[PDB]
């Protein structure tokens, strides 16, 4: 809170943390795409896809 | 070259050469593999091996005569060779196997021995000759459901159903007087050939070849024959080209000479004046390539073939080649046209002036069947010398810029991409 209730310090620190966390999400999206690249996507049949690929 | 029609309707053509030590006499017919249907495909390949059978070749060898035969898509030939002074002996042999007596070659003992020999050749061709069976699959996917897609050797499934009554039916419709040209090359003069033919009176009935229903048409398509147990990848790719009797016949031949042939293991072929060789020699993208321009009676093909072991960089070899074809429309230079003029005159000077009278008899007879005469080599050289840079850019903007292609491939061709990323390289996005 920065005090005894939800007050002026609570709102001023909630806005500064709101500016920052979308940039942490953007860094975790890059780490998400790096793990996707080493194995590729799945397919709705659940079997291997290495026999028939298109770019 | 002298052409003369006789009183009974036989066309005689002769190219005399007094500095040759042999002579060749033969008959060329104007029906090939493109005059069959999918059921009797292979009857021309069977008629060739009946002519070259052992009991026929033993009769000719006692007189000092040699036999040859050639099956193509538009013509067939049956040629006898001898010494210059035995030319009436080779006319009597050709008389007794096409006119007066043909039922002794089609006996049941000779037919079944010949049929199992041809079945062994086509089976060996399909499993061992990979650059040549890819080019035959390119004809069958570019001209599909049209007479120009049948293979000249026949297929293995169609050859096993042929009997002796199929060969007699094909001969009665196509081996006619109005479909034939009698040729002669080497040390033989025109008047002794005409007087020797006129001495035997030769009734020679007045039939006419059957006409085809379907006209040949090009279709953009592809066929893939993947085989991961083979060491290389073999690919052919083409657009629709020029027929015989086209006004752009020599312009299409000069455009293929600009890109030419290549062998990666010959030191002098790596030094040629071709701008494509700068791109492909850095990472060694291929083993060999060659550019062609094939022309038939109805249509044609223009493209290239290749073979490589760099199976992980196939998409760079196709991309670099098609980006050089784009330059014929926008930015082809003057030195490239003058270099290709000199190399084209050397190429077809070695084709029409070899020392083989069997090769000259095939080229002479195939041309009189289509045009009625033969163009001289001196007049073909003046047509090549009058081609400009504007003639090349006008031809390539009509035939190559943003056009449909046909692809065929075998071997380790996993790295060859889809139709639509190869089709989109036929324009540049720049202009
Ligand atoms: C901002 C958030 C996210 C972004 C930009 C994102 C992006 C992507 C992309 C582009 C793919 C590629 C293949 C596809 O579209 O299926 C993918 C796959 C995948 N994502 Fe996400 N994703 C996000 C959130 C999530 C969440 C919340 C989960 C799970 C709790 C998740 C789990 C997965 C999985 C398991 C796959 C693989 C699916 C497959 O290959 O069948 N992702 N993601």
- How do beta strands B261-263 and B288-295 pair? antiparallel
Q: What is the distance in angstroms between the Cα of A15 and the nearest Cα belonging to chain B?
A: 48
Q: What are the tokens at B136?
A: 């035959």
User: What CATH class has B1-202?
Assistant: alpha beta
Distance A52 CA to ligand 1 centre (A): 22
**Domain boundaries along the sequence of chain B:** 1-202, 208-431
Interatomic CA distance for residues B221 and B406, integer angstroms: 5
Interatomic CA distance for residues B305 and B324, integer angstroms: 15
Cβ burial, residue B30 (10 Å; 0-12/13-18/19+): buried
Q: What are the tokens at B326?
A: 């784009």
User: Could you tell me the sign of the dihedral formed by the alpha carbons of B170, B176, B179, B184, in that order?
Assistant: positive
CA B288 to chain centre: 21
User: What CATH class has B208-431?
Assistant: alpha beta
Q: What are the tokens at B334?
A: 């003057």
Could you give the residue ranges of the DSSP H alpha helices within B83-201?
89-98, 108-128, 130-142, 156-159, 164-174, 190-198
The H-or-E segment that residue B81 falls in is strand B76-82
Q: What are the tokens at B302?
A: 């223009």
Angstrom CA distances, B167 to B41, B48, B76, B105, B187, stand at 11, 11, 15, 11, 34
Interatomic CA distance for residues A11 and A15, integer angstroms: 6
CA B108 to chain centre: 32
- In this structure, the number of other CB atoms found within 10 A of the CB of residue B420 comes to 9
Atom 2 in ligand 1: residue holding the nearest Cα: A29
Strand partners, B71: B76
Interatomic CA distance for residues B57 and B54, integer angstroms: 5
Q: Which residue of B has its CA nearest to A51?
A: B414
The answer to whether the CB of B82 falls within 8 A of the CB of B374 is no
Q: Closest by alpha carbon to B125, among B167, B84, B80, B155?
A: B155
Q: Give the DSSP letter string of A1-37.
A: --SSSS-HHHHHHHHHHHHHHHHHHHHHHHHHHHHHH
Residues of B with CB under 8 A from a CB of A: 417-418, 421
- CB of A43 closer than 6 angstroms to any ligand 1 atom: no
Same CATH topology for B1-202 and B208-431: the answer is: yes
Which of A36, A38, A42 to mutate to test ligand 1, by most ligand atoms within 8 A of the CB atom? A36
Orientation of helix B389-399 relative to helix B334-351, angle to 10°: 80
Beta strand segments in B173-278, E: 180-186, 221-226, 233-240, 261-263
Q: What are the tokens at B31?
A: 């029906």
Place of tokens 């002098």: B268
Cβ burial, residue B359 (10 Å; 0-12/13-18/19+): middle
Place of tokens 């073939």: B305
The answer to whether the CB of B73 falls within 8 A of the CB of B369 is no
Q: Which residues contact B201 (CB under 8 A, 6 or more apart)?
A: B8
- CB of A36 closer than 6 angstroms to any ligand 1 atom: yes
Q: Which of A51, A52, A54 to mutate to test the interface with B (most CBs of B within 10 A)?
A: A54
> What is residue B34's DSSP assignment?
G
Nearest 5 degrees, angle CA B224-CA B230-CA B231?
115
The answer to whether the CB of B410 falls within 8 A of the CB of B309 is no
Distance B200 CA to ligand 1 centre (A): 89
Interatomic CA distance for residues B11 and B13, integer angstroms: 7
Interatomic CA distance for residues B425 and B131, integer angstroms: 24
Angstrom CA distances, B181 to A20, B23, B176, B235, stand at 90, 17, 10, 37
Q: What is the distance in angstroms between the Cα of A30 and the nearest Cα belonging to chain B?
A: 28
């Amino acid at each position: 809170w920065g005090g005894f209730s939800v007050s002026n310090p609570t709102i001023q620190r909630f806005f500064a943390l709101h500016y920052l966390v979308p940039f942490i999400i953007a860094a975790m999206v890059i780490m998400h795409l790096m793990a996707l690249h080493i194995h590729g996507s799945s397919n709705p049949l659940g079997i291997t896809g290495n026999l028939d690929r298109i770019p | 070259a002298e052409v003369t029609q006789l009183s009974n309707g036989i066309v005689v053509a002769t190219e005399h050469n007094p500095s040759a030590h042999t002579a060749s006499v033969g008959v060329v017919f104007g029906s090939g593999a493109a005059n069959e249907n999918p059921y009797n495909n292979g009857v021309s390949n069977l008629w060739k091996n009946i002519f070259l059978s052992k009991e026929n070749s033993a009769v000719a060898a006692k007189e000092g005569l040699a036999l040859s035969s050639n099956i193509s898509r538009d013509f067939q030939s049956y040629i006898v060779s001898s010494l210059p002074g035995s030319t009436d002996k080779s006319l009597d042999f050709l008389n007794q196997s096409f006119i007066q007596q043909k039922a002794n070659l089609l006996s049941s003992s000779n037919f079944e021995a010949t049929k199992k020999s041809v079945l062994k050749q086509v089976q060996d061709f399909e499993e061992n000759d990979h650059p040549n069976r890819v080019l035959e699959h390119l004809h069958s996917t570019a001209f599909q459901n049209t007479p120009l897609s049948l293979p000249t050797r026949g297929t293995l499934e169609s050859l096993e159903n042929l009997v002796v009554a199929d060969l007699e039916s094909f001969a009665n419709n196509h081996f006619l007087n109005s479909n034939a040209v009698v040729v002669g090359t080497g040390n033989i003069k025109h008047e002794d050939l005409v007087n020797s033919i006129e001495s035997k009176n030769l009734s020679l009935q007045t039939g006419t070849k059957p006409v085809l229903k379907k006209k040949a048409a090009f279709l953009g398509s592809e066929v893939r024959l993947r085989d991961d147990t083979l060491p290389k990848a073999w690919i052919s790719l083409a657009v629709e080209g020029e027929p015989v009797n086209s006004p752009n016949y020599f312009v299409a031949k000069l455009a293929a000479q600009i890109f030419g042939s290549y062998n990666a293991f010959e030191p002098a072929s790596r030094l040629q004046g071709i701008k494509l060789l700068d791109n492909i020699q850095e990472y060694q993208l291929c083993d060999n390539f060659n550019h062609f321009s094939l022309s038939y009676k109805d249509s044609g093909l223009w493209g290239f073939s290749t073979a490589t072991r760099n199976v992980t960089m196939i998409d760079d070899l196709i991309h670099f080649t098609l980006k050089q074809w784009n330059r014929l429309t926008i930015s082809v230079t003057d030195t490239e046209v003058e270099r290709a003029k000199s190399l084209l005159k050397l190429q077809l000077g070695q084709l029409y002036e070899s020392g083989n009278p069997v090769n000259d008899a095939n080229l002479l007879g195939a041309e009189v069947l289509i045009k009625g005469s033969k163009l001289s080599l001196g007049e073909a050289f003046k047509k090549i010398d009058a081609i400009t840079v504007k003639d090349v850019k006008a031809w390539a903007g009509k035939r190559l810029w943003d056009q449909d292609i046909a692809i065929a491939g075998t071997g380790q061709i996993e790295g060859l991409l889809d139709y639509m990323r190869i089709r989109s390289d036929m324009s540049m996005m720049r202009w």
